[PDB]
Amino acid sequence: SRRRVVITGMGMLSPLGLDVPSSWEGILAGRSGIAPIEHMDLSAYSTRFGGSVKGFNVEEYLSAKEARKLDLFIQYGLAASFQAVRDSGLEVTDANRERIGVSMGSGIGGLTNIENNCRSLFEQGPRRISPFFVPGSIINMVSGFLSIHLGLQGPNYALTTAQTTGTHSIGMAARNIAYGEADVMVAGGSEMAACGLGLGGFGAARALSTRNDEPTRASRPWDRDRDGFVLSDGSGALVLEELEHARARGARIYAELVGFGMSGDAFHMTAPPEDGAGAARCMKNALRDAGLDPRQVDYINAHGTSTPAGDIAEIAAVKSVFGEHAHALSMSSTKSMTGHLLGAAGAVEAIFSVLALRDQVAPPTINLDNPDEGCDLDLVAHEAKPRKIDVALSNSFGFGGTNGTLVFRRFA
Amino acid sequence: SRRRVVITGMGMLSPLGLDVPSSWEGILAGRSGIAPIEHMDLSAYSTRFGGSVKGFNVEEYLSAKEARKLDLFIQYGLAASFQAVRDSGLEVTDANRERIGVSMGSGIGGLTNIENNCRSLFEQGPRRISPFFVPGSIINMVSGFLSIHLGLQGPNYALTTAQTTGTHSIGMAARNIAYGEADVMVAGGSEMAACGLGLGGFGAARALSTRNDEPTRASRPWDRDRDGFVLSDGSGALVLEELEHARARGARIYAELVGFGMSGDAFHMTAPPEDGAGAARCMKNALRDAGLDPRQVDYINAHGTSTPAGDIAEIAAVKSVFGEHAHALSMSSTKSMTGHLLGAAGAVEAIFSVLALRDQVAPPTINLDNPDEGCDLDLVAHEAKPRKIDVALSNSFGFGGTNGTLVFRRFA
Numbered sequence: 144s145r146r147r148v149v150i151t152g153m154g155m156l157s158p159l160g161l162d163v164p165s166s167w168e169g170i171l172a173g174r175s176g177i178a179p180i181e182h183m184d185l186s187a188y189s190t191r192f193g194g195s196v197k198g199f200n201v202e203e204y205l206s207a208k209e210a211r212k213l214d215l216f217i218q219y220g221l222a223a224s225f226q227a228v229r230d231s232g233l234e235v236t237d238a239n240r241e242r243i244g245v246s247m248g249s250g251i252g253g254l255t256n257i258e259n260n261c262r263s264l265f266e267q268g269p270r271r272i273s274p275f276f277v278p279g280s281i282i283n284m285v286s287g288f289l290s291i292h293l294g295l296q297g298p299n300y301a302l303t304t305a306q307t308t309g310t311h312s313i314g315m316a317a318r319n320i321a322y323g324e325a326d327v328m329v330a331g332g333s334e335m336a337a338c339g340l341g342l343g344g345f346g347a348a349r350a351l352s353t354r355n356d357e358p359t360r361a362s363r364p365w366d367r368d369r370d371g372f373v374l375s376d377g378s379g380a381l382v383l384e385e386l387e388h389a390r391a392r393g394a395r396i397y398a399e400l401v402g403f404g405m406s407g408d409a410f411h412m413t414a415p416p417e418d419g420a421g422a423a424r425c426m427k428n429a430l431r432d433a434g435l436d437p438r439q440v441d442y443i444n445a446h447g448t449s450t451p452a453g454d455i456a457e458i459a460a461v462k463s464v465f466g467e468h469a470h471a472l473s474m475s476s477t478k479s480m481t482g483h484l485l486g487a488a489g490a491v492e493a494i495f496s497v498l499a500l501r502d503q504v505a506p507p508t509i510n511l512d513n514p515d516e517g518c519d520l521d522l523v524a525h526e527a528k529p530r531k532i533d534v535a536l537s538n539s540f541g542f543g544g545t546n547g548t549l550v551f552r553r554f555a
Numbered sequence: 556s557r558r559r560v561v562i563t564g565m566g567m568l569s570p571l572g573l574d575v576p577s578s579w580e581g582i583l584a585g586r587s588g589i590a591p592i593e594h595m596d597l598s599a600y601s602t603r604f605g606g607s608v609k610g611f612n613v614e615e616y617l618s619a620k621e622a623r624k625l626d627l628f629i630q631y632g633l634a635a636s637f638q639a640v641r642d643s644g645l646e647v648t649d650a651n652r653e654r655i656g657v658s659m660g661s662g663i664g665g666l667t668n669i670e671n672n673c674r675s676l677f678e679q680g681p682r683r684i685s686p687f688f689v690p691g692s693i694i695n696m697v698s699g700f701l702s703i704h705l706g707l708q709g710p711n712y713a714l715t716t717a718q719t720t721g722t723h724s725i726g727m728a729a730r731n732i733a734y735g736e737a738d739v740m741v742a743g744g745s746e747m748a749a750c751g752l753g754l755g756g757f758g759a760a761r762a763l764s765t766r767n768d769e770p771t772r773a774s775r776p777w778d779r780d781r782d783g784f785v786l787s788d789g790s791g792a793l794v795l796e797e798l799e800h801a802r803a804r805g806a807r808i809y810a811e812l813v814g815f816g817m818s819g820d821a822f823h824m825t826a827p828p829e830d831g832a833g834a835a836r837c838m839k840n841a842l843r844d845a846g847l848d849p850r851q852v853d854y855i856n857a858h859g860t861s862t863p864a865g866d867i868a869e870i871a872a873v874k875s876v877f878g879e880h881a882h883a884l885s886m887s888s889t890k891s892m893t894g895h896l897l898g899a900a901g902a903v904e905a906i907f908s909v910l911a912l913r914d915q916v917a918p919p920t921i922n923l924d925n926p927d928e929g930c931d932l933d934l935v936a937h938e939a940k941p942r943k944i945d946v947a948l949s950n951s952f953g954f955g956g957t958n959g960t961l962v963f964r965r966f967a
């Protein structure tokens with residue numbers, strides 16, 4: 144029957160830090176990671192800022208030889224994965240390598256690489272496409288390259304569920320362990336969509352904040368003056384482990400993963416329904432999966448993208464699931480600081496949820512100057528709130544109406 | 556414990572036909588769907604042929620306007636999915652819509668859309684990128700659009716495991732049902748990479764047959780004159796269903812999905828190990844999952860890509876797993892006829908494995924004129940072989956060393 148799953152290692156690249164502790168320091172200090180993009184010329188674009196990873200050194204993780212072959216989103220995914228495995232203390236051996244797998248995902252994948260190689264094709268012909276173009280760009284090659292470098296022979300796969308990827312990746316990797324298919328999974332997501340195609344494509348949809356003259360104030364979930372999401376880069380990885388396996392090796396356990404919910408809105412390609420009906424179905428699935436009274440939830444790390452329709456749908460969902468308890472829990476969007484890491488969003492935010500439990504603090508929703516109509520919950524405006532947190536929920540809701548909810552709680 | 560999963564509906568686009576029975580008739584006649592690619596200047600390319608879908612009419616499924624928003628790989632996945640749901644006779648209601656989900660995947664996704672939107676960006680700058688570029692290209696939009704069209708509120712996700720995608724999609728959807736997270740799933744995959752970037756990208760790796768003079772002889776799994784795989788387009792979808800749910804509504808049951816195995820080679824980015832140790836672990840994992848002795852396997856739909864090293868690894872893996880039975884079972888690669896549909900390969904090949912069971916015939920490996928060193932198994936060279944088939948395996952072994960095996964059995 145179903146086994147318990149705990150978090151024993153975590154790894155991150157975000158716009159706030161080159162690891163977890165430096166990123167977390169930023170979150171708790173209400174620091175923005177959003178800045179004008181320096182890696183290309185955006186003067187012809189309607190949005191010229193985002194959350195970049197600053198000063199990423201791939202040579203802390205990989206030979207410049209292996210690294211040259213890999214898109215930035217794969218490099219980010221590997222960096223976070225390597226951090227997570229080291230942080231876990233896990234040693235890979237002949238006795239366990241079949242029982243350790245990986246599920247690292249991306250929503251968009253290797254958009255920089257495909258753009259560059261598409262440009263080569265068009266200006267110079269097919270003989271200029273890099274030999275490494277396919278293995279170096281396709282989304283499953285975080286899982287692939289990690290398994291080759293560490294000798295992981297367990298379940299090996301990748302999700303792509305747009306803005307829900309990281310949450311689904313962690314949730315389904317827990318099911319792998321819960322059901323006996325593996326004892327350990329490295330799970331999360333990675334994204335680097337800041338190329339002409341990414342900024343251009345989201346721009347053409349008018350989905351992005353155009354607050355070019357105050358980029359740090361752009362991402363303002365539930366604020367009446369929000370005008371779309373901020374595009375952000377990075378990676379989150381967690382080592383998920385069966386409880387007895389963790390106990391048997393004296394693993395440090397951060398928290399327990401008790402609940403996972405999925406649902407489909409079956410509403411619209413890009414817009415959530417105004418009432419958040421699918422988000423509510425998804426949270427209720429996760430809470431039943433965790434065997435919880437909804438009143439046990441202390442903290443929600445919202446999806447909280449800073450889109451008009453997205454932010455208000457989450458309020459409706461939370462009110463619908465939690466009723467009067469909606470006024471007692473704390474809910475925050477760390478996207479206020481990090482921006483929207485798309486497929487990596489659920490991965491970094493699962494990590495913020497686990498540290499929320501470790502340190503007993505709800506991170507702030509920065510830039511929440513004027514909450515909108517009906518956004519009257521404890522949204523942890525401006526400043527981090529120390530408080531009791533036994534159960535934390537992490538929500539993701541993406542294109543295609545695809546919802547994920549993770550439930551973590553303190554481990555004793 | 557666990558619930559039983561049956562196949563009640565199937566749908567397909569392949570280089571052999573615009574549905575299952577037309578595709579299946581080509582398979583059993585040993586017809587090739589491989590030809591020079593039309594409406595495209597491939598002069599500068601080392602490979603100029605593949606498996607195109609011929610005469611596809613999206614307006615049987617979608618309005619011209621809704622089709623304009625979607626890459627061909629999404630149109631193909633939606634076509635196969637609609638076929639599969641129609642073939643199952645399932646009726647979606649408020650009483651069951653939360654129990655019906657989708658997992659349709661792709662390995663490579665929207666190369667065509669990326670090409671067209673690159674052209675706009677490079678020629679006319681970012682403002683000429685299509686507003687539907689992102690939602691009309693992301694891999695999870697087959698799952699997304701299908702769920703919106705049919706009102707499906709069950710688990711909604713998409714895998715991307717390169718050439719293993721359709722195998723993993725079907726297996727993990729089967730688990731959703733086995734473990735009570737859903738009663739019904741539409742699962743499989745779709746691909747349209749037989750375009751400039753696909754022929755160019757795989758071409759730059761020299762992974763493709765260059766037999767331009769005789770495209771129909773290019774795909775020759777286990778033949779001593781093979782020189783790599785053939786790029787093909789299409790899609791497969793299956794309606795997976797809990798047994799009692801299928802029995803209660805009087806569903807037609809094609810066969811039972813009894814086993815699913817996964818493994819990672821942890822060996823190389825593109826090359827399998829010489830002895831196919833990973834493929835061996837995976838097939839063993841799948842037989843254990845089904846509670847079956849290797850002696851009970853009658854038919855294997857091989858990965859059989861027509862790569863030198865891939866084909867020989869699968870022979871070694873099958874000898875290793877089946878020992879004294881390796882010669883009594885029949886194994887064929889339908890890629891000899893369809894080419895390699897990448898993430899859709901596992902989807903169409905599972906349908907062919909289900910139809911092998913229904914029709915008690917092993918499909919041929921065409922073009923197997925001169926078996927190579929050690930390729931002395933019953934590879935069903937040239938012509939279909941009627942025979943007793945109670946148990947059928949379908950193997951997929953993809954880039955990153957990601958392995959999947961499905962086990963189907965006759966149901967009565």
Ligand SMILES: O=C(C1CC1)N1CCN(c2ccc(F)cc2)CC1
Binds near residue numbers: 253254257
């Ligand atoms: O990039 C690849 C690999 C072939 C290189 N694929 C996965 C991500 N796909 C994608 C494009 C736009 C977009 F908005 C989201 C996803 C494109 C196909």
